[PDB]
Structures are given as structure tokens and as C-alpha cells.
Design an enzyme around this catalytic site. Structure first.
Site, PDB file in Angstrom:
ATOM      1  CG  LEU A  43      -0.253  -2.661  -1.331  1.00 32.32           C
ATOM      2  CD1 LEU A  43      -1.283  -2.451  -2.289  1.00 32.32           C
ATOM      3  CD2 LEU A  43      -0.429  -2.750   0.443  1.00 32.32           C
ATOM      4  CG  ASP A  44      -2.114 -10.242   2.070  1.00 29.75           C
ATOM      5  OD1 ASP A  44      -1.485 -11.085   1.067  1.00 29.75           O
ATOM      6  OD2 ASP A  44      -3.101 -10.970   3.013  1.00 29.75           O
TER       7      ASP A  44
END
Length: 88
Positions: A43-44
Site C-alpha cells: 500500500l502507498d
């Protein structure tokens, strides 16, 4: 692989995460409570923010910067949120 955890919130955290990063049938089939949704799904930093903020405002929980530093896995997160709630 975990019952003591807040099953009530577990559905909320998992429901928010799924839609947060929009998971597919595969991801939902290869997901687990002991699976870092941050590293696994990579995930960013942006998504994570919306995640913690979503759950925070959802349960009106008070999360800090260091608190999340130890919250990466589903179980860990749900546990931290559960410990704050009353439901077992």
C-alpha cells in the site's frame, strides 16, 4: 486464527480496508489477519493515511503517529482498536 479479537470491529476494519485499496477476488481470497496489508499489498503512504483516518473517525478512536508505527498487520490493528472498545 483469532476469536478473542473484536469480531465486531474486525468486520469494520476489513470492510474499510478492502474498499480503501479496492481488493479483487484474488486479494480477498489470499488475505489473512496475520498479513501486513501495508507490505503484502505494498500500500502507498497515501492509502495508509486514509485508512487510519477512516477507522479513526469511524470508531472515533484516538490514534497517534507512534501508535500506527506498531500497527501494520490486520490482527495488530484490530487488536489496538479492540483494546480501546468494550466488545470482546
Amino acid at each position: 486464527p483469532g476469536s478473542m479479537v473484536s469480531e465486531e470491529i474486525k468486520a469494520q476494519v476489513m470492510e474499510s480496508v478492502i474498499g480503501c485499496l479496492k481488493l479483487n477476488d484474488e486479494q480477498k481470497q489470499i488475505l489473512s489477519g496475520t498479513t501486513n496489508l501495508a507490505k503484502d499489498f505494498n500500500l502507498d503512504s497515501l492509502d495508509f493515511v486514509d485508512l487510519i483516518m477512516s477507522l479513526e473517525e469511524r470508531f472515533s478512536l484516538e490514534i497517534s503517529d507512534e501508535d500506527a508505527q506498531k500497527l501494520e498487520t490486520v490482527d495488530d490493528i484490530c487488536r489496538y482498536i479492540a483494546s480501546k472498545s468494550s466488545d470482546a
